[PDB]
Short mmCIF file of C-alpha atoms and ligand atoms in Angstrom, two decimals:
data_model
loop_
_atom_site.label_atom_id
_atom_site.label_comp_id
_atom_site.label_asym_id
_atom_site.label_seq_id
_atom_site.Cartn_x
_atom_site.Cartn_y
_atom_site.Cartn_z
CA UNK A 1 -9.87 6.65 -32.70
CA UNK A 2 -8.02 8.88 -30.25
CA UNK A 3 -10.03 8.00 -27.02
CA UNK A 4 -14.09 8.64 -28.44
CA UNK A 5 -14.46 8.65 -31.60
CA UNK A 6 -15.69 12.70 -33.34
CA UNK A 7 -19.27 12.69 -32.78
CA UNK A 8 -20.59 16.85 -33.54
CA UNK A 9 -23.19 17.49 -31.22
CA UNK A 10 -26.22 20.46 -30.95
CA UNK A 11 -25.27 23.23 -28.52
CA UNK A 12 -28.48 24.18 -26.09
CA UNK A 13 -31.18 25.80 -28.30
CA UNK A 14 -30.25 24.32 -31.76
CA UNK A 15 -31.80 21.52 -32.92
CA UNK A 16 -33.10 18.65 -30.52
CA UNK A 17 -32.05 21.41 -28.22
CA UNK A 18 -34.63 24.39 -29.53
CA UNK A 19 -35.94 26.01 -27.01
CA UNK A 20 -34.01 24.60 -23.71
CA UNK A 21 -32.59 26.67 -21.07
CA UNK A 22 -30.30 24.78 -19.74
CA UNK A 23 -28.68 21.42 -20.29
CA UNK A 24 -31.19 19.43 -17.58
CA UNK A 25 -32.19 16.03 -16.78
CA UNK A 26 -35.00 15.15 -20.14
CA UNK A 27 -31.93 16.39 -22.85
CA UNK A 28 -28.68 15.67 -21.21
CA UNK A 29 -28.51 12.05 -22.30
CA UNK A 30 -28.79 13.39 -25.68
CA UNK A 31 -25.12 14.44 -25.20
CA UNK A 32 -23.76 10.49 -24.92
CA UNK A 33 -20.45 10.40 -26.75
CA UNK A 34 -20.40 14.03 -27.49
CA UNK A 35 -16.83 14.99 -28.36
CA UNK A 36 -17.74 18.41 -29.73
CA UNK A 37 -20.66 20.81 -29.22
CA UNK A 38 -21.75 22.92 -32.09
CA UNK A 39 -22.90 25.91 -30.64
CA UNK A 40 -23.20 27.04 -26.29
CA UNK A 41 -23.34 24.94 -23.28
CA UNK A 42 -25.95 26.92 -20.20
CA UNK A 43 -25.81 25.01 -16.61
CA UNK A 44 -28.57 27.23 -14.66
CA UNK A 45 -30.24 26.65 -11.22
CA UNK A 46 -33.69 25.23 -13.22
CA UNK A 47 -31.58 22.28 -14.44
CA UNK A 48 -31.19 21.27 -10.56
CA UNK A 49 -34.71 22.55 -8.95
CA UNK A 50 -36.67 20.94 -11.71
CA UNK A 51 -39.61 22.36 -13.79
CA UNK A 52 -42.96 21.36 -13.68
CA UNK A 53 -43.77 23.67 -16.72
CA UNK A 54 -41.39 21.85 -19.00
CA UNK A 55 -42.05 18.83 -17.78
CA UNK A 56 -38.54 18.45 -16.29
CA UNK A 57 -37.05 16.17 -13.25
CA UNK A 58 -33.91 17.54 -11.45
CA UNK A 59 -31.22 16.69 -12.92
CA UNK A 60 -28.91 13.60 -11.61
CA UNK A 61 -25.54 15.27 -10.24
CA UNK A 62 -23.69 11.60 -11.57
CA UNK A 63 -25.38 12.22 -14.96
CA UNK A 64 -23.43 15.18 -15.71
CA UNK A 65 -20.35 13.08 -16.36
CA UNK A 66 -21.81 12.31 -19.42
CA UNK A 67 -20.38 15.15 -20.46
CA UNK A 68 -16.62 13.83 -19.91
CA UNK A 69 -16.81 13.24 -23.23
CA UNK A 70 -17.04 16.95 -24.62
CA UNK A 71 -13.52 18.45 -25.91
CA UNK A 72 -14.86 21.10 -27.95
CA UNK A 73 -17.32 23.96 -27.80
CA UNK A 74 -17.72 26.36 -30.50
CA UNK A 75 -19.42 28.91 -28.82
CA UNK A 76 -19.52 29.48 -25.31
CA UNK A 77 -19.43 27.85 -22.11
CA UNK A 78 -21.58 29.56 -19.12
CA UNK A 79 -22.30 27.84 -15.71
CA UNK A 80 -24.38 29.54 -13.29
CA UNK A 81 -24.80 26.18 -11.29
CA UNK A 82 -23.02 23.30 -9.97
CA UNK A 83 -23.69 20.46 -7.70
CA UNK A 84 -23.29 21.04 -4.21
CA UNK A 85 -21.72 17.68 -3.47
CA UNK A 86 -19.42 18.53 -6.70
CA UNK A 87 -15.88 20.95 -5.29
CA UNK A 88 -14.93 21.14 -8.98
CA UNK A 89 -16.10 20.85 -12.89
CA UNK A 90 -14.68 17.73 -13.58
CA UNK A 91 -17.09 16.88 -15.55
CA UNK A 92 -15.50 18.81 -18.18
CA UNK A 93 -12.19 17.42 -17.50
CA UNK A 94 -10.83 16.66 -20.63
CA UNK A 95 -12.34 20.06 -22.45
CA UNK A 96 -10.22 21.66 -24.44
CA UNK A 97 -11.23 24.28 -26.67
CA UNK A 98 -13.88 26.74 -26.27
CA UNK A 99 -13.82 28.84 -29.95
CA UNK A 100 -16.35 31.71 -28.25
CA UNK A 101 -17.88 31.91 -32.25
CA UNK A 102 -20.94 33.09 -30.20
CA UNK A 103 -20.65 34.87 -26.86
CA UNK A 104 -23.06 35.56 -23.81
CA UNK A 105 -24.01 39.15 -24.25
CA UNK A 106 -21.87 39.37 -26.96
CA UNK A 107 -18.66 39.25 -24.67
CA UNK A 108 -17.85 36.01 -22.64
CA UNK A 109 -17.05 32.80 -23.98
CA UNK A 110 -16.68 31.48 -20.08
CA UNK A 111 -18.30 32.57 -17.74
CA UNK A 112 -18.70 30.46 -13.63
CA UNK A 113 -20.90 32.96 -11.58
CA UNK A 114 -22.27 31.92 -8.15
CA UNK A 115 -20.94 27.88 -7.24
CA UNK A 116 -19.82 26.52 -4.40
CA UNK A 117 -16.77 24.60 -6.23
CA UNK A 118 -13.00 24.94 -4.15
CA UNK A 119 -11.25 24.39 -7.62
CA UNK A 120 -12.79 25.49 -11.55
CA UNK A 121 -11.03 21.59 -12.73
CA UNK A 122 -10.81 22.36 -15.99
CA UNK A 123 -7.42 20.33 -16.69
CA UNK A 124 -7.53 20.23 -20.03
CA UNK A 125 -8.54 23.44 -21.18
CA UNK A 126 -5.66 24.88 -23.76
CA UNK A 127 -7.38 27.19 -25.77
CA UNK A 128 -10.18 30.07 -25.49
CA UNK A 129 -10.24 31.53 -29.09
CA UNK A 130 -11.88 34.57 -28.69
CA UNK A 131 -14.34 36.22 -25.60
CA UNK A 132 -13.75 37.43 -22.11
CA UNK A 133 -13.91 35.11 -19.53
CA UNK A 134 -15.79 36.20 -15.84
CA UNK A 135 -15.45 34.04 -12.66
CA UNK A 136 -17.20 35.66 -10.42
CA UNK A 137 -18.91 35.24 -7.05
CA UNK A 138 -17.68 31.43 -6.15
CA UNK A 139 -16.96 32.23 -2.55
CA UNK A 140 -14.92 29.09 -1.84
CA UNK A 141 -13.26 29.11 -5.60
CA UNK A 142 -9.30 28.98 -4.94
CA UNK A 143 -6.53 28.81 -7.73
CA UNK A 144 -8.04 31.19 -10.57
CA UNK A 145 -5.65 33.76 -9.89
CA UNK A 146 -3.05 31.40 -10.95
CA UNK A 147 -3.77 30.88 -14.16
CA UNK A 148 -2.13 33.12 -17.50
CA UNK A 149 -5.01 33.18 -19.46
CA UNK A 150 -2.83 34.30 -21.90
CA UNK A 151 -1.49 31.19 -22.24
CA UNK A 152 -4.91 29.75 -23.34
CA UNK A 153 -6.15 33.30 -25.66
CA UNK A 154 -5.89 33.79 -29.10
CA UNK A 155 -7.14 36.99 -30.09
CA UNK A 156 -6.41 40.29 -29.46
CA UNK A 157 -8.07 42.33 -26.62
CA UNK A 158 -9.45 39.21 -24.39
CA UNK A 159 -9.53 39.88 -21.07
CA UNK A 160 -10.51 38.02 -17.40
CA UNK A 161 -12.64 39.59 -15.23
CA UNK A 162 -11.91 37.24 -11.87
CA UNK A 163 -13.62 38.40 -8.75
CA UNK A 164 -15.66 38.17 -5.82
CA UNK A 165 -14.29 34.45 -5.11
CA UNK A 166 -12.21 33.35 -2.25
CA UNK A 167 -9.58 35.86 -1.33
CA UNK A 168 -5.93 34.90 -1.97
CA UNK A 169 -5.09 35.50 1.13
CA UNK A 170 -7.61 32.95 2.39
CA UNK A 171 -6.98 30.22 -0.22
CA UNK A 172 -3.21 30.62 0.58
CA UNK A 173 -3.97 29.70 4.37
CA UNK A 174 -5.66 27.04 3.71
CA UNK A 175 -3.09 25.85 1.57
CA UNK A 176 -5.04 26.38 -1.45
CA UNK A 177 -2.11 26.52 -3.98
CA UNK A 178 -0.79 24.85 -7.16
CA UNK A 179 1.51 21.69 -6.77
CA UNK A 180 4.99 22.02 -6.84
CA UNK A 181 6.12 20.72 -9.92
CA UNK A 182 3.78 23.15 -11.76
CA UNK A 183 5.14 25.94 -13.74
CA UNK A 184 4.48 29.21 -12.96
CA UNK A 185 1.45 29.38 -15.46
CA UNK A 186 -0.71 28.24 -12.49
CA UNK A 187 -2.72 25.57 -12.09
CA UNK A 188 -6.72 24.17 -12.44
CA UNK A 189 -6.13 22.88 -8.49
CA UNK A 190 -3.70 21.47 -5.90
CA UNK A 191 -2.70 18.30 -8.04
CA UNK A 192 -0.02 17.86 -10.33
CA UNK A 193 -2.63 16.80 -12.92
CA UNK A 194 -3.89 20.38 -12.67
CA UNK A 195 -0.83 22.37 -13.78
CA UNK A 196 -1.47 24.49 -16.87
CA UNK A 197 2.16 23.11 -17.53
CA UNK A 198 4.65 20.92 -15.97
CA UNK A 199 8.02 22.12 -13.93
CA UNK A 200 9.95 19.28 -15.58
CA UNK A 201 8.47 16.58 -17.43
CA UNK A 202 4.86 15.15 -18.10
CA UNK A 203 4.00 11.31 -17.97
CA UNK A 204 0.37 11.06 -19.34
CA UNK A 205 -1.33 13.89 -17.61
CA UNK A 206 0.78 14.40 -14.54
CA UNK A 207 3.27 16.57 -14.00
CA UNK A 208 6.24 14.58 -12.66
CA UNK A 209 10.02 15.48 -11.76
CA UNK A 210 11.86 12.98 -13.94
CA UNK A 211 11.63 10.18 -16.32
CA UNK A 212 12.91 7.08 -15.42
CA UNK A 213 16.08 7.03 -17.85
CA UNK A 214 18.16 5.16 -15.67
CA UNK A 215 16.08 3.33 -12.82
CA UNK A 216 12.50 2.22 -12.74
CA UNK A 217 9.76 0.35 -14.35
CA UNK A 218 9.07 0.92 -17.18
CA UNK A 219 12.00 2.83 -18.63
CA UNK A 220 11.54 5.74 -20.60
CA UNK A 221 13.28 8.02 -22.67
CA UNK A 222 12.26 11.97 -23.00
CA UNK A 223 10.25 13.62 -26.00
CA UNK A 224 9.41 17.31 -25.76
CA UNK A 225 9.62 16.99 -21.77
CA UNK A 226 7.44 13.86 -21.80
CA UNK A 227 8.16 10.46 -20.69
CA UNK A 228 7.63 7.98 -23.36
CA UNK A 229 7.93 4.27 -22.20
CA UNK A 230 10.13 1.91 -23.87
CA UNK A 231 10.20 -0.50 -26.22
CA UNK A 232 9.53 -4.04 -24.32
CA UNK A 233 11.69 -5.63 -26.38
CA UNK A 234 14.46 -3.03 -25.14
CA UNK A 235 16.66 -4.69 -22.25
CA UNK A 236 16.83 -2.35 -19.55
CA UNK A 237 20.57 -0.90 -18.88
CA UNK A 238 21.57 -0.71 -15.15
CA UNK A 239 24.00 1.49 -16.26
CA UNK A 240 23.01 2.98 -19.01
CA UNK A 241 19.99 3.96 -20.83
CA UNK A 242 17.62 1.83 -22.10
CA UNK A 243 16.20 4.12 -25.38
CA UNK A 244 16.72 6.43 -27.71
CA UNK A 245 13.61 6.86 -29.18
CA UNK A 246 10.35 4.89 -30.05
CA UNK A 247 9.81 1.68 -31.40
CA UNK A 248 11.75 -1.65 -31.53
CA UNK A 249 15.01 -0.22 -33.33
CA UNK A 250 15.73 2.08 -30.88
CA UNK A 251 16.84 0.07 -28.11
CA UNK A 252 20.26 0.04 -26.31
CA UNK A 253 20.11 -3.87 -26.28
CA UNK A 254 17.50 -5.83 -27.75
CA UNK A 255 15.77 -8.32 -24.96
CA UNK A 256 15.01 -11.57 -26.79
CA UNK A 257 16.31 -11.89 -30.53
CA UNK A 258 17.44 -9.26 -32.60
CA UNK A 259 16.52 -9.08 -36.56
CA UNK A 260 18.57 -6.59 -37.91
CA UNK A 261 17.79 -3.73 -36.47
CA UNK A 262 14.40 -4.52 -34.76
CA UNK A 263 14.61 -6.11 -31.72
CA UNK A 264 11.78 -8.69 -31.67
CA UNK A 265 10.21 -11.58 -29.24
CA UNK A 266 10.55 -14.17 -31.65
CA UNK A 267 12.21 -14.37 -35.03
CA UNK A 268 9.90 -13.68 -38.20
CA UNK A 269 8.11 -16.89 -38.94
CA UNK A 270 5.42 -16.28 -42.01
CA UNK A 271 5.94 -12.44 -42.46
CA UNK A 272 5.40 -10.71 -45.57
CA UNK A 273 8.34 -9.71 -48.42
CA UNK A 274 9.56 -8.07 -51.32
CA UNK A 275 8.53 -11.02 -53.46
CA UNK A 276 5.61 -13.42 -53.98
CA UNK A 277 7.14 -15.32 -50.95
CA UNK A 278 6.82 -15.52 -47.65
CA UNK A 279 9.67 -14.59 -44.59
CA UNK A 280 11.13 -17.36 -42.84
CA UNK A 281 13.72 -17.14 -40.23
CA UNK A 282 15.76 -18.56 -37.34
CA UNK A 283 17.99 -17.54 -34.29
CA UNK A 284 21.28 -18.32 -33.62
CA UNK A 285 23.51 -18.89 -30.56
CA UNK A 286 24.09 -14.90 -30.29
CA UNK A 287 20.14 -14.57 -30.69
CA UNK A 288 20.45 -12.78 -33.92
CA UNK A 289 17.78 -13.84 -36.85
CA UNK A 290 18.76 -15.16 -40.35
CA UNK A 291 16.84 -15.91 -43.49
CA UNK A 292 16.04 -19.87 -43.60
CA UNK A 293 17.13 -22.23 -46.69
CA UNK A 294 14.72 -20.94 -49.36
CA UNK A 295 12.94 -24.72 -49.73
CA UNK A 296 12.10 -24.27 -46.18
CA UNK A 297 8.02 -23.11 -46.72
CA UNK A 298 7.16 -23.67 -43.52
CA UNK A 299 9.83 -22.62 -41.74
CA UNK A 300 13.28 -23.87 -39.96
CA UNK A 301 15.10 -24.14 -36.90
CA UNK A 302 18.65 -24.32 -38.27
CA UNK A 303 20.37 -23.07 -41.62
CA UNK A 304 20.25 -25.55 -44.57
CA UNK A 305 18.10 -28.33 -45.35
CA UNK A 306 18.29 -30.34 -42.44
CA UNK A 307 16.93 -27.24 -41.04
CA UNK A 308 13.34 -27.84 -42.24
CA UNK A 309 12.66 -32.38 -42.18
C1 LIG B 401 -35.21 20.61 -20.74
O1 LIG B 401 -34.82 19.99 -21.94
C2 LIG B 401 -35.94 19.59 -22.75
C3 LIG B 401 -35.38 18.87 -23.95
O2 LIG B 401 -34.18 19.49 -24.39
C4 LIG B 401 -36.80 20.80 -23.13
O3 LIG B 401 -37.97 20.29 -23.76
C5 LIG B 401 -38.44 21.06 -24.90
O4 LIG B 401 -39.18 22.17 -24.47
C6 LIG B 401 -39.65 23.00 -25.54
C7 LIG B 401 -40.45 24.11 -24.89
O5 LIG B 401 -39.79 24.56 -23.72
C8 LIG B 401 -40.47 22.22 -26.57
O6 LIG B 401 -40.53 23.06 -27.72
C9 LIG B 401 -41.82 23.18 -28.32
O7 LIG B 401 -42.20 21.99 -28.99
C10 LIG B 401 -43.47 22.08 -29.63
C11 LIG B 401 -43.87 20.67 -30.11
O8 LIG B 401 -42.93 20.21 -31.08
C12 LIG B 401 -43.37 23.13 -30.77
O9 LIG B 401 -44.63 23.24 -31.43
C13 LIG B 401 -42.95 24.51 -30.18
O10 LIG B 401 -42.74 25.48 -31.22
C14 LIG B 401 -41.72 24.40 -29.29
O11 LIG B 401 -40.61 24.26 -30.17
C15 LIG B 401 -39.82 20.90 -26.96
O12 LIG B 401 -40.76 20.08 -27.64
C16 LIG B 401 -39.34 20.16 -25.72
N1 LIG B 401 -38.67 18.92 -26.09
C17 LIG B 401 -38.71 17.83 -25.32
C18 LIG B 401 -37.98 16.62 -25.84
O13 LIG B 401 -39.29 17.82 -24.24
C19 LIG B 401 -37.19 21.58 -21.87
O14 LIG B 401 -37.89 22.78 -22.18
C20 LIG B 401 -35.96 21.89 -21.04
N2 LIG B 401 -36.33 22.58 -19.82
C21 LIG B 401 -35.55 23.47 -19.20
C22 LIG B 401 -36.12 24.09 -17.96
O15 LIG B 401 -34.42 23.74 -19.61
C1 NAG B 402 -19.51 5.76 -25.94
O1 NAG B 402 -20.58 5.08 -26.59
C2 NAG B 402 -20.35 3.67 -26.76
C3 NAG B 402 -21.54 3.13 -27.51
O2 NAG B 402 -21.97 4.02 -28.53
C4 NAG B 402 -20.13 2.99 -25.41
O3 NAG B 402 -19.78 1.63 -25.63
C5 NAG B 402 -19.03 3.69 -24.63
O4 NAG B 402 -18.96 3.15 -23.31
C6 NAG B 402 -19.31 5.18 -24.55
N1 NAG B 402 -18.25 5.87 -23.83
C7 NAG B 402 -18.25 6.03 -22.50
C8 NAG B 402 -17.08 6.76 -21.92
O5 NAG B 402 -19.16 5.61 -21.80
C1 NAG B 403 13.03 20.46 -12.39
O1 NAG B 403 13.00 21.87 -12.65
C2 NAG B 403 13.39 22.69 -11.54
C3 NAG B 403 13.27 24.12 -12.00
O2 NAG B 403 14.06 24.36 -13.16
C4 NAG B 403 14.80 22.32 -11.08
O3 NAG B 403 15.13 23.06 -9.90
C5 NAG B 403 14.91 20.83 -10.81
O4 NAG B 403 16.25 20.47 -10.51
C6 NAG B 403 14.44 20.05 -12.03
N1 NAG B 403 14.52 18.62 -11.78
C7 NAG B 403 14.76 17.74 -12.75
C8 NAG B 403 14.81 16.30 -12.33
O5 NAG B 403 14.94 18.08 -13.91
#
């Protein structure tokens, strides 16, 4: 179901959410297995101090990762606290979208005023559909001048308004700067899981230099600049390749027995055909599968009858 399954979600002051500031410690379990938010997200300073008149504890810093779950928000995303044991929003780690449908003051779609964080951590953000985005006032916040928002905008006329945060200078000297193998479309922090795209190649969500083609465990073969593993049933090459593609029929050399073109761990033994009738096969010296004599019903090790006493 492609990681968590779609679950749509109220966005603060719809709903289970009416009247609620801020995501805080009575409604934020309400977000379990959220994958998208219909509506905004608001993080404020009440959500942390508590409030006695709502009848609301502070809010658990380890409880906001139940929000890991969240790749979509269809209006806007604004955070004017964090955490002070927290250097980055990893909580929203695997966000992706923000539409900005609805924006704060009519304008931002993001918006991180006044945290503590080193790094904003939002690897997965791709997209920010329409609205400004303002980062402003997080004193120790490195790496958001790296980013090309453009890169993530769709719409005509959005702009970034990045300032008051740690001076480049400063972040620079403290060797506050994306990874290496990032491109130059900057970076979410110093990792090479934080580039907003890879130098090279990508295996999962890192940013690597190379696939293994010809060395290494597993072997891989490249698709759109990202390393795909192998087949298992694909021998690895010591000189060669091992791949050319996905799947069982697009080894090099098969590894066990070959049917046709699959290459397969065992030969067929019960599989399904073109006919009321059931595939039965066997393997020969060279490892390759053939069809069994046709009274064998419950399969054969050799061709003929005597295959099948
Ligand atoms: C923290 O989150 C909780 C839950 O999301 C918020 O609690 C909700 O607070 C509002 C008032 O602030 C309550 O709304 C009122 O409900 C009454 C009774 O149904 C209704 O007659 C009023 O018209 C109004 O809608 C709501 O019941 C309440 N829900 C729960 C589950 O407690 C809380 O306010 C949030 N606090 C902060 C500081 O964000
Ligand atoms: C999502 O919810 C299911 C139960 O509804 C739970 O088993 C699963 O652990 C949840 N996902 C995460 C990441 O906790
Ligand atoms: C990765 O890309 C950089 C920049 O184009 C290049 O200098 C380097 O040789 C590349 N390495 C591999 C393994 O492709």
């Amino acid at each position: 179901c492609e990681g968590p399954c779609r679950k749509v979600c109220n966005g603060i002051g719809i709903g289970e959410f009416k009247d609620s500031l801020s995501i805080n410690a009575t409604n934020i379990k309400h977000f379990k297995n959220c994958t998208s938010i219909s509506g905004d997200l608001h993080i404020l300073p009440v959500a942390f101090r508590g409030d006695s008149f709502t009848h609301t504890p502070p809010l658990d810093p380890q409880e906001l990762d139940i929000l890991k779950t969240v790749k979509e928000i269809t209006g806007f995303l604004l955070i004017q606290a964090w955490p002070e044991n927290r250097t980055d929003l990893h909580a929203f780690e695997n966000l992706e979208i923000i539409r900005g449908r609805t924006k704060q003051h009519g304008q931002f779609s993001l918006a991180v005023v006044s945290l503590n964080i080193t790094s904003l951590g939002l690897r997965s953000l791709k997209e920010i559909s329409d609205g400004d985005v303002i980062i402003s006032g997080n004193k120790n916040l490195c790496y958001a001048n790296t980013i090309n928002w453009k890169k993530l905008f769709g719409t005509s006329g959005q702009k970034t308004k990045i300032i008051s945060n740690r001076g480049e200078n400063s972040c620079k000297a403290t060797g506050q700067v994306c990874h290496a193998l990032c491109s130059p479309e900057g970076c979410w922090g110093p990792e090479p899981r934080d580039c907003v795209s890879c130098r090279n190649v990508s295996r999962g969500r890192e940013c690597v230099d190379k696939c293994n083609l010809l060395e290494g465990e597993p072997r891989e073969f490249v698709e759109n600049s990202e390393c795909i593993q192998c087949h298992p049933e694909c021998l690895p090459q010591a000189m060669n390749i091992t791949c050319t593609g996905r799947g069982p029929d697009n080894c090099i050399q098969c590894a066990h027995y070959i049917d046709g073109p699959h290459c397969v761990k065992t030969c067929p033994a019960g599989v399904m055909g073109e006919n009321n009738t059931l595939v039965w096969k066997y393997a020969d010296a060279g490892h390759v599968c053939h069809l069994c004599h046709p009274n064998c019903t419950y399969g054969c090790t050799g061709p003929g009858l005597e295959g099948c006493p």
